[PDB]
Design a binder for these strands. Structure first.
Ligand SMILES: [K+]
Ligand SMILES: [K+]
Ligand SMILES: [K+]
Ligand SMILES: [K+]
Ligand SMILES: [K+]
Ligand SMILES: [K+]
Ligand SMILES: [K+]
Ligand SMILES: [K+]
Ligand SMILES: [K+]
Ligand SMILES: [K+]
Ligand SMILES: [K+]
Ligand SMILES: [K+]
Ligand SMILES: [K+]
Ligand SMILES: [K+]
Ligand SMILES: [K+]
Ligand SMILES: [K+]
Ligand SMILES: [K+]
Ligand SMILES: [K+]
Ligand SMILES: [K+]
Ligand SMILES: [K+]
Ligand SMILES: [K+]
Ligand SMILES: [K+]
Ligand SMILES: [K+]
Ligand SMILES: [K+]
Ligand SMILES: [K+]
Ligand SMILES: [K+]
Ligand SMILES: [K+]
Ligand SMILES: [K+]
Ligand SMILES: [K+]
Ligand SMILES: [K+]
Ligand SMILES: [Mg+2]
Ligand SMILES: [Mg+2]
Ligand SMILES: [Mg+2]
Ligand SMILES: [Mg+2]
Ligand SMILES: [Mg+2]
Ligand SMILES: [Mg+2]
Ligand SMILES: [Mg+2]
Ligand SMILES: [Mg+2]
Ligand SMILES: [Mg+2]
Ligand SMILES: [Mg+2]
Ligand SMILES: [Mg+2]
Ligand SMILES: [Mg+2]
Ligand SMILES: [Mg+2]
Ligand SMILES: [Mg+2]
Ligand SMILES: [Mg+2]
Ligand SMILES: [Mg+2]
Ligand SMILES: [Mg+2]
Ligand SMILES: [Mg+2]
Ligand SMILES: [Mg+2]
Ligand SMILES: [Mg+2]
Ligand SMILES: [Mg+2]
Ligand SMILES: [Mg+2]
Ligand SMILES: [Mg+2]
Ligand SMILES: [Mg+2]
Ligand SMILES: [Mg+2]
Ligand SMILES: [Mg+2]
Ligand SMILES: [Mg+2]
Ligand SMILES: [Mg+2]
Ligand SMILES: [Mg+2]
Ligand SMILES: [Mg+2]
Ligand SMILES: [Mg+2]
Ligand SMILES: [Mg+2]
Ligand SMILES: [Mg+2]
Ligand SMILES: [Mg+2]
Ligand SMILES: [Mg+2]
Ligand SMILES: [Mg+2]
Ligand SMILES: [Mg+2]
Ligand SMILES: [Mg+2]
Ligand SMILES: [Mg+2]
Ligand SMILES: [Mg+2]
Ligand SMILES: [Mg+2]
Ligand SMILES: [Mg+2]
Ligand SMILES: [Mg+2]
Ligand SMILES: [Mg+2]
Ligand SMILES: [Mg+2]
Ligand SMILES: [Mg+2]
Ligand SMILES: [Mg+2]
Ligand SMILES: [Mg+2]
Ligand SMILES: [Mg+2]
Ligand SMILES: [Mg+2]
Ligand SMILES: [Mg+2]
Ligand SMILES: [Mg+2]
Ligand SMILES: [Mg+2]
Ligand SMILES: [Mg+2]
Ligand SMILES: [Mg+2]
Ligand SMILES: [Mg+2]
Ligand SMILES: [Mg+2]
Ligand SMILES: [Mg+2]
Ligand SMILES: [Mg+2]
Ligand SMILES: [Mg+2]
Ligand SMILES: [Mg+2]
Ligand SMILES: [Mg+2]
Ligand SMILES: [Mg+2]
Ligand SMILES: [Mg+2]
Ligand SMILES: [Mg+2]
Ligand SMILES: [Mg+2]
Ligand SMILES: [Mg+2]
Ligand SMILES: [Mg+2]
Ligand SMILES: [Mg+2]
Ligand SMILES: [Mg+2]
Ligand SMILES: [Mg+2]
Ligand SMILES: [Mg+2]
Ligand SMILES: [Mg+2]
Ligand SMILES: [Mg+2]
Ligand SMILES: [Mg+2]
Ligand SMILES: [Mg+2]
Ligand SMILES: [Mg+2]
Ligand SMILES: [Mg+2]
Ligand SMILES: [Mg+2]
Ligand SMILES: [Mg+2]
Ligand SMILES: [Mg+2]
Ligand SMILES: [Mg+2]
Ligand SMILES: [Mg+2]
Ligand SMILES: [Mg+2]
Ligand SMILES: [Zn+2]
Lengths: 104, 208, 83, 99
RNA sequence: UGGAGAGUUUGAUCCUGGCUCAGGGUGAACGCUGGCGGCGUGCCUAAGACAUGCAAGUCGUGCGGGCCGCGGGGUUUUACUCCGUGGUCAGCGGCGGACGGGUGAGUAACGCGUGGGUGACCUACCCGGAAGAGGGGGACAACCCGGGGAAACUCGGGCUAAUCCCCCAUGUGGACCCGCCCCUUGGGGUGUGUCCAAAGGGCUUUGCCCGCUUCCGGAUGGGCCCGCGUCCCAUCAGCUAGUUGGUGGGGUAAUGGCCCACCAAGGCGACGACGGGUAGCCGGUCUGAGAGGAUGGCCGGCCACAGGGGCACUGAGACACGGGCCCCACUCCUACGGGAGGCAGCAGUUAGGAAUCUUCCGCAAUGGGCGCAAGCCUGACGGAGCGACGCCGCUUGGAGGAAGAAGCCCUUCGGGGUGUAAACUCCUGAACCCGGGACGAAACCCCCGACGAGGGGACUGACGGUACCGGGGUAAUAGCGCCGGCCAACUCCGUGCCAGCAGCCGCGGUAAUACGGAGGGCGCGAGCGUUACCCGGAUUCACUGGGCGUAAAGGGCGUGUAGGCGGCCUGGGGCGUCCCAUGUGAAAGACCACGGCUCAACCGUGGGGGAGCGUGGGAUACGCUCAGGCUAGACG
């Protein structure tokens, strides 16, 4: 069945497209500990209906573009930037770990 | 290859009596009955406390040297025994005992195992009618091991089977001295066999 | 088209085929679509030919084309007997 | 010193020229139609559109276009023509365009 | 049903710790040795270069001819010309040449694996169902005539058939635009308008066969997409402009920046982007008690490639190993303008290498292409050949033989050992010689029947006069390593830190069980050793299963980001977690059982499993999440 995923909209600076961050949890194959890895999906939002901070369902779809095979199925829960926050920061720390400038 | 060579020296090294000759092994000429000490220029010297290894080696070498089987064949049987269900030691002895060349010896068609081997290779034996000349052929419970009809009139088979008139046969077998045939009733139980061998040590030798 | 034929499986001088449904283009001993029987040309045992005639009829009903030998074997097992 | 299947190469070349030609026609008329429609010439543009439609379906009879390739072309054609017309309007000869 | 440890740091000890050995394995190679058979297996290096032969054709029941030949006609005869027929040759036309066979270069990727999606798709031949095939027109080879070239081959003119091409018709139907209905991504229906069909051949010739057209469906095969999984280096940290997305096009069977205009300014990254290295992936395989480690040869599946790079044509399908075009490197031909070619098909040659086979037989069998069929093609395959390369089976003899020959070796010089071993005696009788001699092969076809069901008959064997059965019948290959400890097996002589051994510890400088020989002994046996490499032992990368005061190991200290982790009570949710059912988990392999070759190796049949993932249903203790509460943590 068309895979359905739930996630948070972390970007919407694109036309009719939003970025959804989907987390997942599983037992490390050798160390057991439940670890939590995640991935971002560019989902189709033709009505520009979804905004930053929405937790949405996403459904496997027919290609809309390269790098874009999912459509926003529906809104699960509105606004909640606490999630958008983790992301933004986790990305900001990247500056402070190379050779140039950054923030601690 | 099945060895082929001085067999009494094998008795002398194992210190026990193996019957690689049938008669003579019951006679005051048995060598074991007049030189129970190992062969070679040191047979009469003071034996040194054997190593745990030596003990296991000597013990297995004894059991194998009894059936005249190759270390190759021998090892394969043991592995097969180890795989099968039930006490490995016994199952091992059952298989070793299910070898036609051995069964032909048990039914007294031959004086020794090495003789029963030749009697098989040369067709003088039969299994359920059809002849078999594979010393390693595995007799199953219910089979009938007989002498080849064309062979029933052999100076050697005459003697051997005559001498059988009167002798007893293993509880797992059953001879018929008249028709020159017998049957493998069932796999011999450990108790039925009275070999001067501690199969327990053997299983350990292959554990190393 | 898809066929019903014999795939070789025994050993040298010891042939044992498998009556099989496969695409005509596949190598003979390759991935078949279904096994519907077997055949021992040397009748080494009382059971030298078995054919799932209910299944044979199915494939035949969908286009499967049998070899002349496969057909011969299927017939022997009453695949076409309409009596 | 070789295979008489050089024949397939000869055949291919004729088949190639045969296709190339059927298509050139299709394109040329297709444009002609789109152009007339764009200029408001309805009766004229539809008239030509039908040839195009016919040539396309015909090309599909054999292995020139075949498939849904014709379908695709007819579609894109009738759409561009119907739309270009509607920007002045009045589909006269009511050629291939359905009511 | 599954888990052994030992040697070596010290005067001695305990610990830490590395090193080494014993086991199993290999597409092996090397040394000494080498008898038979079955099965399997054999360029691991130069994806280097290749002589030669063969490796993909087939239809005359689609069509018209040329050449060679025979026969029969029209005439009073010749000439000229009509018809029938045999051989042969290509040509036009069709189906196949996209399979089968080879390789592993490239590739760290939706390539592969596993599970899903396609309302975003195609599928020749095969099957089922519905409908149909009326009329007309045309061209190019062949052939004929002429020009050009050394050749390859080429330019021009002329005639001609068709299941070749085209036009009109018929419209079951189908396609397209617009509308409406259901349905929900482009799915199904309906209406008007437009557009779209066809090929004939064979007869046992007036009724069948083979074939043709359109459409719906099946079946098989395939495209594209998505989740998760897939090595090393962070002494690679930032990467990106078709880049990320949008609108409109183009393109395709089809989605998509796949491509193109134009607009936006995005996308990716420590959960490792980008870069560098290495590498086809899998079923499996080897090892291991397991977890795991290593691996991907044979066989089966997928992918990629076909001298190197790029490209499209034809077609249901190719961007095409034995098709085409261009560039490059190379080999060959050249009358110097210009041509020909590609073994990673089978066999073979050459080069490289420690190392990897026959220029074999057959198309009898299974499978494939074309054909109505007869049949043709098939280096696919079925066989044989070579190589102990591996596995299994087998032989070199069996029984009797001295308080024990000789020779040889020790010796307390009494005697001890090789040893019942030998010679001998009797018995059997591998090899070899005769006779017989096979399964694999019954279909296709023909006859009857209805070209069906059913029944009947005929042909056909490479392997091979092989397997195997019967008769006769000789007593007739044994080697290799080791013997100081680990490690099973000891003495003399020789040598004198020499010659040498050596896996680790070490051994040899005058009486060495350690070097060399001999006698004796242990191990294994058509083999035995060696080298190399993988796992093991090694809980020595420790998840199972380790450590850091002094053995290697605490960061010089704080502050703090991400992240990891989180006190007590109640409630909702049910993501983790657990349960049930279900689908998937090819075959081979592995396990068990029965069975076929006299056994076994090998093989057949059957059975049992299986983690993971999809779907439906359920549980809610713990973890998570949301909501509320608390005060024992923390803070004030
Ligand atoms: K940045
Ligand atoms: K069908
Ligand atoms: K054409
Ligand atoms: K070569
Ligand atoms: K792809
Ligand atoms: K002519
Ligand atoms: K011409
Ligand atoms: K209509
Ligand atoms: K179809
Ligand atoms: K399909
Ligand atoms: K599919
Ligand atoms: K677009
Ligand atoms: K474990
Ligand atoms: K691995
Ligand atoms: K691997
Ligand atoms: K693996
Ligand atoms: K056919
Ligand atoms: K019949
Ligand atoms: K014989
Ligand atoms: K002899
Ligand atoms: K000396
Ligand atoms: K000394
Ligand atoms: K010595
Ligand atoms: K020595
Ligand atoms: K190791
Ligand atoms: K320190
Ligand atoms: K520091
Ligand atoms: K709850
Ligand atoms: K295993
Ligand atoms: K499940
Ligand atoms: Mg937006
Ligand atoms: Mg995900
Ligand atoms: Mg057991
Ligand atoms: Mg042709
Ligand atoms: Mg033009
Ligand atoms: Mg040490
Ligand atoms: Mg030391
Ligand atoms: Mg140690
Ligand atoms: Mg020290
Ligand atoms: Mg010391
Ligand atoms: Mg072990
Ligand atoms: Mg040699
Ligand atoms: Mg062979
Ligand atoms: Mg190679
Ligand atoms: Mg050539
Ligand atoms: Mg040929
Ligand atoms: Mg011809
Ligand atoms: Mg292939
Ligand atoms: Mg290779
Ligand atoms: Mg590769
Ligand atoms: Mg890379
Ligand atoms: Mg996938
Ligand atoms: Mg689909
Ligand atoms: Mg049909
Ligand atoms: Mg005509
Ligand atoms: Mg000319
Ligand atoms: Mg002309
Ligand atoms: Mg109609
Ligand atoms: Mg509609
Ligand atoms: Mg309609
Ligand atoms: Mg009209
Ligand atoms: Mg028409
Ligand atoms: Mg007709
Ligand atoms: Mg588009
Ligand atoms: Mg499109
Ligand atoms: Mg792009
Ligand atoms: Mg940027
Ligand atoms: Mg590579
Ligand atoms: Mg372990
Ligand atoms: Mg195992
Ligand atoms: Mg394992
Ligand atoms: Mg393979
Ligand atoms: Mg090459
Ligand atoms: Mg085709
Ligand atoms: Mg095409
Ligand atoms: Mg090709
Ligand atoms: Mg390709
Ligand atoms: Mg080639
Ligand atoms: Mg060389
Ligand atoms: Mg054939
Ligand atoms: Mg055939
Ligand atoms: Mg003597
Ligand atoms: Mg003797
Ligand atoms: Mg005899
Ligand atoms: Mg005799
Ligand atoms: Mg034939
Ligand atoms: Mg007839
Ligand atoms: Mg008839
Ligand atoms: Mg019949
Ligand atoms: Mg010892
Ligand atoms: Mg001296
Ligand atoms: Mg010297
Ligand atoms: Mg000395
Ligand atoms: Mg000693
Ligand atoms: Mg030594
Ligand atoms: Mg380990
Ligand atoms: Mg641990
Ligand atoms: Mg430690
Ligand atoms: Mg320290
Ligand atoms: Mg400190
Ligand atoms: Mg702190
Ligand atoms: Mg924190
Ligand atoms: Mg808690
Ligand atoms: Mg937390
Ligand atoms: Mg749940
Ligand atoms: Mg399941
Ligand atoms: Mg399986
Ligand atoms: Mg059996
Ligand atoms: Mg099975
Ligand atoms: Mg399970
Ligand atoms: Mg569930
Ligand atoms: Mg609940
Ligand atoms: Mg809760
Ligand atoms: Mg709370
Ligand atoms: Zn004795």
């Amino acid at each position: 069945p068309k895979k359905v995923l739930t996630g948070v909209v972390v970007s919407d600076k694109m036309q009719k497209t939003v970025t959804v961050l989907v987390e997942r949890q599983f037992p490390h194959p050798l160390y057991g500990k439940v670890i939590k890895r995640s991935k971002k999906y560019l989902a189709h939002d033709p009505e520009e209906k979804y905004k930053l901070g929405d937790v949405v369902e996403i459904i496997e779809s027919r290609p809309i573009s390269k790098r874009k095979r999912f459509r926003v199925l529906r809104l699960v829960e509105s606004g909640r930037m606490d999630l958008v926050e983790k992301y933004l920061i986790r990305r900001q720390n990247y500056q402070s770990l190379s050779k140039r400038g950054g923030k601690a | 290859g099945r060895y082929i060579g001085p067999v009494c020296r094998l008795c002398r090294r194992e210190g026990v009596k193996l019957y690689l000759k049938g008669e003579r092994c019951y006679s005051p000429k048995c060598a074991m009955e007049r030189r129970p000490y190992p062969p070679g220029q040191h047979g009469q010297k003071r034996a040194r406390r054997p190593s745990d290894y030596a003990v296991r080696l000597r013990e297995k070498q004894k059991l194998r040297r009894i059936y005249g089987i190759s270390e190759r064949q021998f090892r394969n049987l043991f592995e097969e025994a180890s795989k099968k269900k039930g006490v490995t030691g016994s199952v091992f002895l059952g298989l070793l005992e299910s070898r036609l060349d051995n069964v032909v010896y048990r039914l007294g068609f031959a004086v020794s195992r090495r003789q029963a081997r030749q009697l098989v290779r040369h067709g003088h034996i039969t299994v359920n009618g059809r002849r078999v000349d594979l010393p390693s052929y595995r007799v199953r419970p219910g089979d009938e091991i007989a002498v080849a009809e064309k062979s029933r009139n052999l100076e050697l088979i005459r003697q051997n089977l005559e001498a059988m008139k009167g002798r007893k046969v293993g509880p797992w077998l059953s001879l018929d001295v008249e028709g020159m045939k017998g049957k493998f009733l069932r796999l011999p139980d450990r108790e039925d066999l009275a070999l001067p061998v501690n199969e327990q040590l053997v299983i350990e030798f292959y554990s190393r | 088209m898809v066929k019903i034929r014999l795939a070789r499986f025994g050993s040298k001088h010891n042939p044992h085929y498998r009556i099989v449904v496969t695409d005509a283009r596949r190598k003979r001993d390759g991935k078949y679509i279904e096994k519907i029987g077997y055949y021992d040309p040397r009748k080494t045992t009382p059971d030298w030919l078995k054919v799932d005639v209910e299944r044979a009829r199915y494939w035949l009903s969908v286009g499967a084309q049998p070899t002349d030998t496969a057909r011969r074997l299927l017939r022997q097992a009453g695949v076409f007997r309409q009596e | 010193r070789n295979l008489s299947a050089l024949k397939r190469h000869r055949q291919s070349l004729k088949r190639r020229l045969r296709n190339k030609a059927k298509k050139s026609a299709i394109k040329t008329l297709s444009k002609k139609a789109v152009q007339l429609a764009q200029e408001g010439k309805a009766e004229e543009a539809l008239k030509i559109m039908r040839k195009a439609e016919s040539l396309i379906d015909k090309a599909a009879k054999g292995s020139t276009l075949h498939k849904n390739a014709a379908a695709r072309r007819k579609s894109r054609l009738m759409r561009k023509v119907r739309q270009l017309l509607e920007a002045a309007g009045a589909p006269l000869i009511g050629g291939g365009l359905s009511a």
